Ligand binder design. Sequence first.
Ligand SMILES: [Zn+2]
Length: 121
Amino acid sequence: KENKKLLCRKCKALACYTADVRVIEECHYTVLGDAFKECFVSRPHPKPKQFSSFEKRAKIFCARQNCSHDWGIHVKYKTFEIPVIKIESFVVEDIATGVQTLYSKWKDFHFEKIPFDPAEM
DNA sequence: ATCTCGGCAGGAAGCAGAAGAGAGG
Ligand SMILES: [Zn+2]
């Protein structure tokens, strides 16, 4: 498998696998499934606002109370409410070796980037 | 008709550079 783990960059908690990640409109990344909702907590967005196809409701954070690292935002997209994750918020871990890589640009991070399909909901 | 602008710093996004829709500062 080319499947990789994303860990919290601050505490190294498991956030999700690249197999769960989907791309919206070429440059915003979300995570599928109910597992990911156990990994983050929301706070209301201090400056909630529309941009492009998104209405920002919340910021999301590592669910660990001693960590609380910023992970991205929670948005309304179409009829859905979805997380949008920052690449800077995570380290990418090779599952076989446990070696960790830091990215600040999604374009530097080479993995199978599957477009978001509403039918997967 | 270009070029310009060090770890947070003029009104999408980490050694040299996406979103109320550039100006000579
Ligand atoms: Zn964390």
